[PDB]
């Protein structure tokens, strides 16, 4: 196969694991940081699951398999990583939590799964860098490259023996629920956040909004998904700015990459050219981030928090940008 596969060991271990009962008022909020929980993070997605699904929703030895194994399919890249994955999931368990009967059972198991999934074997290029220099996963997948790889991961993960945790559903749920990863993971491509988040203000505006329109639905999710992967922008100014470290030291590196190969990366992903990097970040929380709750918060309003986080950033950013 081409996914990796954890030991024994690991999987055992997970089983046992019993968050502490601090971390347990904690892992609620929508600001929770689980940068200083290294060593729990497979657990803390474990009991995020129990939470928001049931405890005996999946088989526990098929659950702990499968996330030591999705773990070991993460890289070593300075954001696109393990943790990214973990932060992801948290942020999409406070939504579901505070949203909890909106969406379905099967819709929640869908969605935790596809945040832990939604940057599976990501090499730290965005789909703009392999598309130009024809990567060979660009041959394979002509647009959102990198989505189309990771749901391909998630899926070689559920085959990976005693792995498919999905496979007590019916047939026909087995099927809904790896739609619904499908588009969940694709969502993740920023380059369509923009279309889908037009859409949504468009139907809000207008009332025309229909969370039982199959369609209108596959768009909120998208949303959800964007503001899960964005949720760095969601923290406490500290945490903020250090993920915002790995984002540019990810992106920096894809930029030494382009150098080498005789084309010059545009000033955000130029590392000589860090002093604007503070005017970018205005310009995505002004252009992406602040859109993207804004809208959130419109359709779902107990995620209201998370777009106070981001104003809360967007003026520390101001505050670099002036004094
Ligand atoms: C490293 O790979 C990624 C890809 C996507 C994300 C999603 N994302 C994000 O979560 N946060 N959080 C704070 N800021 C950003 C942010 C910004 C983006 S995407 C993005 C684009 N942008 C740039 O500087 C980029 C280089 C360029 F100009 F193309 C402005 C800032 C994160 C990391
Ligand atoms: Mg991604
Ligand atoms: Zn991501």
Partial sequence: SMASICTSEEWQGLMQFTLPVRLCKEIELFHFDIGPFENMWPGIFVYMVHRSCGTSCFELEKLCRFIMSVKKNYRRVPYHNWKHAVTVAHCMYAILQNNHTLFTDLERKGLLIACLCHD????????????????????????????????????????????????????????????????????????????????????????????NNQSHRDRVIGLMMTACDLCSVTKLWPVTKLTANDIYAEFWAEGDEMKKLG????????????????????????????????????????????????????????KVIRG
Avoid at 150 to 167: D, K, P, R, Y
Avoid at 267 to 285: A, C, I
Avoid at 286 to 299: D, F, R, S
């Fill in 263 to 318: 084309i010059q990366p545009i000033p955000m992903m130029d590392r000589d050219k860090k002093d604007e990097v503070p005017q970018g970040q205005l310009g995505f929380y002004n252009a992406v981030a602040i859109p993207c709750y804004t809208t959130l918060t419109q359709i779902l309003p107990p995620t209201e928090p998370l777009l106070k986080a981001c104003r809360d950033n967007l003026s520390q950013w101001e």
């Fill in 120 to 211: 599976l074997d990501h090499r730290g290029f965005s789909n703009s860098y392999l598309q130009k220099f024809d990567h060979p996963l660009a041959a394979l997948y002509s647009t959102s490259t990198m989505e189309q790889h990771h749901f391909s991961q998630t899926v070689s993960i559920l085959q990976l023996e005693g792995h498919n945790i999905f496979s007590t559903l019916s047939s026909s749920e087995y099927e809904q629920v790896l739609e619904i990863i499908r588009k969940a993971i694709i969502a993740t491509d920023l380059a369509l956040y923009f279309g889908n988040r037009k859409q949504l203000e468009e139907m809000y505006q207008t009332g025309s909004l229909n969370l």
